[PDB]
Structure 1
Amino acid sequence: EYPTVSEIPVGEVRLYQIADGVWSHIATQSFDGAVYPSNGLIVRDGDELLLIDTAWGAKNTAALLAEIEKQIGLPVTRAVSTHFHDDRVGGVDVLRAAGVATYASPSTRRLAEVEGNEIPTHSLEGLSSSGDAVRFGPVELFYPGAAHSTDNLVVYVPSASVLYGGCAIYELSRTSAGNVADADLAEWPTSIERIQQHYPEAQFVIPGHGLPGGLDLLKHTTNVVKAHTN
């Protein structure tokens, strides 16, 4: 039932219902000779929608907006990017042109600029130090510390017990880190420990790439990261 990489042509976007008023979006993109799936989140925000992460590119993000209109039918008014990589910010220009106010931490915005990526318009305050949390409409934004990247955020939807871990959390079948370029492998386990302490009632845990799971994904990710470290 959760769509997989070989089921989604590049340029198409699927939506998956996680709970009332909470969906993931799933897209695919070609990178370095392979095609990968990627997830984000959509959360009902009253009569509007909050988007977490782009669909990894301008064309995909346009398809995301079209699918949202067709399937959900409320406007996206705000978006948050959970770190600076193109799977998170690529498509912010389409979002802005569609009327969406785009947000990221000050660090994410600076990192995206230096990388040559699109830059969310607005800075999120109150997220500069590990352990910082802020409310943003129907979600809590949390900076757990460096992990997959120095700037990575996670997102919790309290009304639904959904934790969106983004690229800091691996799907269960994933047994290797792949590219660790921008990661802080020494810090990552401690960042995950912060997440576990802050969100012990999470029921659904959504990774940045691959299948949803539960809080088991936290220990799993720690195991993979430590194994690479050695």
Structure 2
Amino acid sequence: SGEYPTVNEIPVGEVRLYQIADGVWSHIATQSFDGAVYPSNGLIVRDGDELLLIDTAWGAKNTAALLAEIEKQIGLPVTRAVSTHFHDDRVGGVDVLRAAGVATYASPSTRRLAEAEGNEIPTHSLEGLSSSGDAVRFGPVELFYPGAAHSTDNLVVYVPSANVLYGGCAVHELSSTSAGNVADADLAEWPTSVERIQKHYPEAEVVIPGHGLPGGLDLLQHTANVVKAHKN
């Protein structure tokens, strides 16, 4: 009923949308992994009379449900999607998207890692993002590569019209007590990568983590703090 929806409020296989700003929504879904259930976020950005999707809803059937929820709530076609790293909460569902006519994109790094992992592979490579600090425009967003953090390939996404920073899995929610799933992380570089984000987007008003509740700029420092305390 209007609060941001949490893991125990969303059955696996349903998707919720949350209005962040004019023309900006998050999507929230839940999935089982290794015997536990987790929420995850993505982004939807209005692109004239079309929509840009950032990240899948973590699985094929969740992503089909995402498309249906978009049609219900927004009613504009999703024409392009960007996946912000290679894990299944970001690319699982790309095959569903592709067969719905969505053009799917990711950095070459992400594409390689997805293929090596046996995950679904976005079709199109996003060049111009290979060095930390790189940025490119993609429809109504800017894509930024901050350096290795949660994963070596993680991208963040900024919506300049709304000052919305979508950190993806490089950014954790304020209630977070741990650095999440660090199996592919660089704990040593993660703070430095977060500092790059902080420097590059000082006017961000809303920060959206890859999992959990949006907030303000404090999510960035909180993330650095939790990662440093984990590494220790």
Alignment TM-score, normalising by the size of structure 2: 0.99
> Cα deviations across residues 49-83 of structure 1 (Å, max 9, x unaligned)?
00000000000000000000000000000000000
What is the rounded CA distance, in whole Å, between the counterparts of 1:175 and 1:3 in structure 2? 19
> Cα deviations across residues 1-51 of structure 1 (Å, max 9, x unaligned)?
000000000000000000000000000000111100000000000110000
Aligned-residue offset at 1:180: 1.6
Other-structure match for 2:150: 148
Aligned-residue offset at 1:179: 3.0
SS in 2 for 1:24: strand
Aligned-residue offset at 1:175: 1.0
| Structure 1: stretches of 5+ with no match in the other structure | none
Aligned-residue offset at 1:198: 0.4
Other-structure match for 2:93: 91
Aligned-residue offset at 1:228: 0.8
What is the rounded CA distance, in whole Å, between the counterparts of 1:7 and 1:228 in structure 2? 28
SS in 1 for 2:212: coil
What is the rounded CA distance, in whole Å, between the counterparts of 1:21 and 1:171 in structure 2? 23
> Cα deviations across residues 94-116 of structure 1 (Å, max 9, x unaligned)?
00000100000000000000000
What is the rounded CA distance, in whole Å, between the counterparts of 1:84 and 1:206 in structure 2? 19
Aligned-residue offset at 1:229: 1.0
SS in 2 for 1:173: coil
What is the rounded CA distance, in whole Å, between the counterparts of 2:14 and 2:155 in structure 1? 26
What is the rounded CA distance, in whole Å, between the counterparts of 2:137 and 2:182 in structure 1? 30
What is the rounded CA distance, in whole Å, between the counterparts of 1:203 and 1:177 in structure 2? 23
Other-structure match for 1:40: 42
Please, what is the CA RMSD of the aligned residues? 0.5
Deviates more, 1:116-125 or 1:171-180: 171-180
Aligned-residue offset at 1:199: 0.2
2:73 matched to 1:71?
yes
- List structure 1 runs of 4+ shifted beyond 3 angstroms: none
What is the rounded CA distance, in whole Å, between the counterparts of 1:172 and 1:227 in structure 2? 14
> Residues 99-114 of structure 1 correspond to what in structure 2 (within 5 A)?
99-114=101-116
> Cα deviations across residues 120-155 of structure 1 (Å, max 9, x unaligned)?
000001000000000001000000000000000000
Other-structure match for 1:214: 216
Distance 1:23 1:178, change over 3 A: closer
> Cα deviations across residues 147-192 of structure 1 (Å, max 9, x unaligned)?
0000000000000000000000000000112432100000000000
Aligned-residue offset at 1:197: 0.4
Alignment TM-score, normalising by the size of structure 1: 0.99
What is the rounded CA distance, in whole Å, between the counterparts of 1:122 and 1:190 in structure 2? 29
